[PDB]
């Protein structure tokens, strides 16, 4: 199937409290595999996945040096933006970037990413044509003009179509099967109620990976999406995820409801109902 290599970058100023905090986090198929955190005595790029430990010392050295270079460049960008926005030197500000490539099964780029945000709002982004830019405001228009003159889009298309795809292949060779990892959910239904003629049935999905999952409740073939309560998928903290969906039903009709669990690790969707313990 398709794969992706993307870096999530963060630069946060802290006037009076020290140098800006800079971070570079790499993801292969939405899984963190490397991280650089400037908040240290001697900051270094590090593996976040055991399979990256294969890379030799020269790799880590080049990545570390490039990261510190990026950090210092962003330090300047933070100042530049205070200027573009006519802002004070005393407030904290954040610059964020999502930069990467998602390639198809045939090894060709499906989509390139080079998008920026300032204080949580879109700043500028490279368009799908990998040739033009979309500035979100007046400030971004200055960067746009500057990048157009420098041929920045061409520079990024090169990286996105070449360098990024090539590195993704390399990383996949060392952690392909690992990324293919799949933990199917284990489900069960709990019964809850406060002295009333109604009861809550909560369908739980535990220990699954990846996070993508769907839970539904059915009353005789029909999905109850109107009054079904559910929580956002959440990390158990051990690499797997959790999620639940609940519905309020009439006391005594618990057996008329069925929960369905859809996950990529399941040979077939799970089907279950409330089971009063023996």
């Amino acid at each position: 199937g398709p794969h992706s290599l993307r870096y999530f970058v963060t630069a946060v100023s802290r006037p009076g409290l020290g140098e800006p905090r800079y971070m570079e986090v790499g993801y292969v198929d939405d899984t963190e595999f490397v991280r650089f955190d400037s908040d240290a005595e001697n900051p270094r790029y590090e593996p976040r996945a055991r399979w990256m430990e294969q890379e030799g010392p020269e790799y880590w050295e080049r990545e570390t040096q490039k990261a510190k270079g990026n950090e210092q460049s962003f330090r300047v960008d933070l100042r530049t933006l205070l200027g573009y926005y006519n802002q004070s030197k005393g407030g904290s500000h954040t610059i964020q970037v999502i930069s990467g490539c998602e390639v198809g099964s045939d090894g060709r780029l499906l989509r390139g990413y080079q998008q920026y945000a300032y204080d949580g709002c879109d700043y500028i982004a490279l368009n799908e044509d990998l040739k033009t830019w979309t500035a979100a405001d007046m400030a971004a228009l200055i960067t746009k003009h500057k990048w157009e003159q420098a041929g920045e889009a061409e520079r990024l298309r090169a990286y996105l179509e070449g360098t990024c795809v090539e590195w993704l292949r390399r990383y996949l060779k060392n952690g392909n099967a690992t990324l293919l990892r799949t933990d199917s959910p284990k489900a069960h239904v709990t019964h809850h109620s406060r002295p009333e003629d109604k009861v809550t049935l909560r369908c739980w999905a535990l220990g699954f990976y990846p996070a993508d999952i769907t839970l539904t409740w059915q009353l005789n073939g029909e999905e109850l999406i109107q009054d079904m309560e559910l929580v956002e998928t959440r990390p158990a903290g051990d690499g797997t995820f959790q999620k639940w969906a609940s519905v309020v039903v009439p006391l005594g009709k618990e057996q008329y409801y069925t929960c369905h669990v859809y996950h990529q690790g399941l040979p077939e969707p799970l089907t279950l109902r409330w089971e009063p313990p023996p």
Binding site: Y7, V9, E24, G26, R62, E63, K66, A67, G69, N70, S73, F74, V76, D77, T80, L81, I95, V97, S99, Y116, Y123, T143, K146, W147, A150, E152, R155, L156, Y159, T163, C164, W167
Partner: peptide, 8 residues
């Protein structure tokens, strides 16, 4: 490997 970022 991440790209070397340009100035804003």
């Amino acid at each position: 490997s991440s790209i070397e970022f340009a100035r804003l």
